[PDB]
Symmetry: C2
Subunit: 374 residues, 2 copies
Amino acid sequence: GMGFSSELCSPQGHGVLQQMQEAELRLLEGMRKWMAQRVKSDREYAGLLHHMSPDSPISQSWAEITSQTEGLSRLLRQHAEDLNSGPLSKLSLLIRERQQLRKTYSEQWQQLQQELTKTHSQDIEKLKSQYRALARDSAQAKRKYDKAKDKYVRSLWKLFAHHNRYVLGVRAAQLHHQHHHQLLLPGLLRSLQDLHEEMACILKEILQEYLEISSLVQDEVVAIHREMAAAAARIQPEAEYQGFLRQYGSAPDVPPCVTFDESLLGELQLNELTVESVQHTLTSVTDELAVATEMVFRRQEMVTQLQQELRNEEENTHPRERVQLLGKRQVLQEALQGLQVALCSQAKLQAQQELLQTKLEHLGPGEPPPVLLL
Amino acid sequence: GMGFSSELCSPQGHGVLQQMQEAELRLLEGMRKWMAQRVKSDREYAGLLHHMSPDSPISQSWAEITSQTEGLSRLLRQHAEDLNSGPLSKLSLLIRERQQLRKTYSEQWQQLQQELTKTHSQDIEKLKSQYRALARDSAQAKRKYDKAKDKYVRSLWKLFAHHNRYVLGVRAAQLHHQHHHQLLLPGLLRSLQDLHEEMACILKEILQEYLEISSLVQDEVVAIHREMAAAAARIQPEAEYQGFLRQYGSAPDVPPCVTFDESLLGELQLNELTVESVQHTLTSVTDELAVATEMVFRRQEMVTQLQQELRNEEENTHPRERVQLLGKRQVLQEALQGLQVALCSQAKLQAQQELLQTKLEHLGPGEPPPVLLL
């Protein structure tokens, strides 16, 4: 398979890996700022939700929805604190350990390059340069060859001694070049990759820890949103004013009614003088009652028109858009009181008409009772 | 059952209901400010989440989690706008219609009280006061009684005419007091309750509409939080640098190795001069290799100690607390390179020892080849 050890085992590949390490720190630095703003976001939101903040079902329900919204505000504050102390602080540590790996890797990599240069190149070239010198030094003594033997024998002694020292230097250099390009440099690149794949595992876990803490759909947020919805659902509109009427309720205040005062003398006096006054009063009261019944008719036709107009809108309004019907309901409320007064006015004239008609019959064909003055 | 019509049919009960209407507007006014701060809350949070904001699995996953967090920010802005235009604007209208009902109810209620006072009390007292006057006026004419008859006849004509006019006034007053305390005032209180129970239905729907719009656990928020979690879960740590190695990968740069240069003359020359140089070099190289093998042993015992210490911590660390192991892993990384160099150093001395031992045997018991000078 592919790897740093096999594919990036070149001085070019070193530059590639040195840039990745910088580009990955550049990303994780962005991730820190990104997470740090979510800490700022959730805290100010907690502060904004916190600034938002009698036996009625609605008042009891209101007290919960407002109290649970406080519960939300405090939860968003905990999110920011856990995020700050948890995956953010872990991401910071990941950046600090990566900042070491930049130096460690590169100064290790250069340390291996210096060793090879010394054993493979530098040491060899110093052995080579000396092997030339001693070979030339011997060739001079050969030309010059009593004492020419001895000095030529020494020159060959050292040439052969150096030759063998150079052989061993070449074998040491050969096996370094072997262990450099097969084990040392591949072994380093292998270790860098394996650690970077371990730090990919750390970052995934850090990211996933962020998502869980910063979750607005997690079980604890659902638990609050249910408590809120449950409180609103508990509201019974038709049982709103039951508790109200148990405390502030009383028996109807009905004053004493008008009874005919017997200190000024409830029967209509029908005598010879009043008879024609009573006959005219029944004519006029009848005329008034027919106009009062005409008034009742207009106001019932008004009520009926407004009632049927409301039924039509009730059917053609979405249940949450019924706040627009309060206007027409209040106009019907005025029309219904109007009718109720017209009935009271009609009724009054009926009771007056009754007295006149009843007393005018009780006489019937009889002579209007004469006024006796003793 | 209990109701405004039956329990609050008293001037005391009017004061009670006038205060409720104020206390309910006082609540709904608080609900408006409360909701209006949630509009402010969700907009600034959207602004705070907005301010937060290459073929790598993590880079692709990062690009989604950041892009979906933008999707969240925009969603919180829509929440605030819908809340502002929806249940807030509806709550405002509910306050405006209630502000009318305060005036309408009270001025209606006083209009009914004025009618009763007129028909029941005022009109009656004016009929009473006149009935006294005409009764006294007649009693004078009776005492004074030719012309005394005529003037006494007139006084009785009007007394009896007024008596009947007062009878009809009392019957009108009686039936008003009836229709006031049975129909008019109960009918009004009934209508006020029914409308207030309708406005309790409106408020429940307004509150529930708020909760749905302002829901942070609703389906659209879940849809984003899943997309985020799915992106983080997609991250494959061990497939992070596969795409990286396909683009930036190359074949290993292995320079040409050291081969014994034949311009300076790879066999150790074993003659009569070099023999004792070769015998000593194998002694010294052997001494070095035993020290180099001692070095390999120390560094393998160091690697083994650090490997077993890491296995112990790997087992006793929560998977998200593994960022603390990067320190010990990097110390093992240095120990592993240390070992790999010690093996390279050991190996070099082995290859040198081989050449010396192999050449010293190839001679064996033979006479160190003599140096021939032609």
